[PDB]
Amino acid sequence: SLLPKDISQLLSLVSATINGVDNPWSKDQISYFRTLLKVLFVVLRGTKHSVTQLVLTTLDRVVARSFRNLAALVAATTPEDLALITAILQACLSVPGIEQCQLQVLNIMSSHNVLQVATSLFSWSDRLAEKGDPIYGELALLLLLELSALPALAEQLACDGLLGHLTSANLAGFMRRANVSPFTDNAGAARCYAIWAKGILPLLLNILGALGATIAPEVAFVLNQFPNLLRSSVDRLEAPGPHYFVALVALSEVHSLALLTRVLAALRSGNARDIPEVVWDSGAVLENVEFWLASRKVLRERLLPLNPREAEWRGMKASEGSGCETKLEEKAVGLLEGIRDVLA
């Protein structure tokens, strides 16, 4: 064989190279494996075709197998190794040609332990991360979340009672404490919010891939066991005049909840199965949204980036059809503008 000239031949060579590594995650050569995975991630993101069999071969031999090993708390491995694996999964599922072979992924995943152990890890988190924050809590859900974008795998989680494990977990008591907020001096509460906003809620939006005829009483019951959050989500976006700033995640949380409560309501009018009502004042949200839409100046002043990624497109700019000055504002505008459409 010659040198790789195609992006697919590069993918073959990198993947052929990953399998060659005798003992991954071993104290010696764990660091070399770490950058191989990073090379894989670059190539996979590079697969915009700017071939699909390799990606499916990668999902078993690389992604599934590695997570199985990551339950090692005996070993030079870190949370960021899991995050790297979660990342490689995203790159795989973004490649053109995938999403037609979802049962394939379902097949591949279910073969290993995976979501069973991913769920296990979620119920573990606090005993395994009270350095300050349940770091493995968010990592587990984000793994599940990425998979839940595939409707078939979404059905498996609910059938295996993921929503049951979510509320029964020890974590459910920490998220329930009234200190959970994106702007906390506490590391735990800050991660608790991350698990709920960036994990639980987008999970629920996807689990309703089974049309919400079923699971709707279960998704409504999940939300119903975090009322301090349903209450906080509205108060956080309150027009200026115990909250100083406003985050982008706060807008997506409310965006998620607005979709859930509306879809649930369009399923409650079915009058055919008991879908519990969820206490979430839509009225306050709408008004809060309008008095942030009509004030781009006071918006960009109070709006703060929380992630190094979000800060990138904060100092950036994207005018086009201009109602915003910076790109971060545009994304901020985009979110709460959709919340207006939904609740209407």
Author numbering: 1445 to 1494, 1510 to 1533, 1538 to 1704, 1721 to 1823
Paper excerpt:
Nucleocytoplasmic transport across the nuclear envelope is controlled and facilitated by nuclear pore complexes (NPCs), very large, modular protein assemblies. The Nic96 complex organizes four architectural proteins, Nic96, Nup157/170, Nup188, and Nup192, as well as the more disordered protein Nup53/59. Nup188 is a stacked helical protein with intrinsic flexibility. Moreover, we can show that both Nup188 and Nup192 specifically bind to FG-repeats and translocate across NPCs by facilitated diffusion.
The C-terminal fragment (Nup188C) includes residues 1445–1827, and we solved its structure to 3.0 Å resolution. Nup188C crystallized in space group P212121 with two copies per asymmetric unit. The C-terminal fragment of Nup188, Nup188C, is a right-handed arc-shaped superhelical structure built from 19 helices that form 6 helical repeats, which are stacked in regular order. The first helical pair (α1 and α2) forms a HEAT repeat followed by 5 ARM repeats. The inner face of the structure is built from helices α2, α5, α8, α12, α15, and α19. The C-terminal helix α19 caps the structure. At the N terminus, helices α1 and α2 expose a hydrophobic surface, which strongly suggests that the full-length protein continues in a stacked pattern. This hydrophobic surface engages in a twofold symmetric crystal packing contact with a neighboring Nup188C molecule resulting in a horseshoe-shaped dimer. Because this contact is generated by a protein truncation, we suggest that it is a crystal artifact and not physiologically relevant. Interestingly, the two Nup188C copies in the asymmetrical unit have a different curvature, likely reflecting the intrinsic flexibility of the molecule.
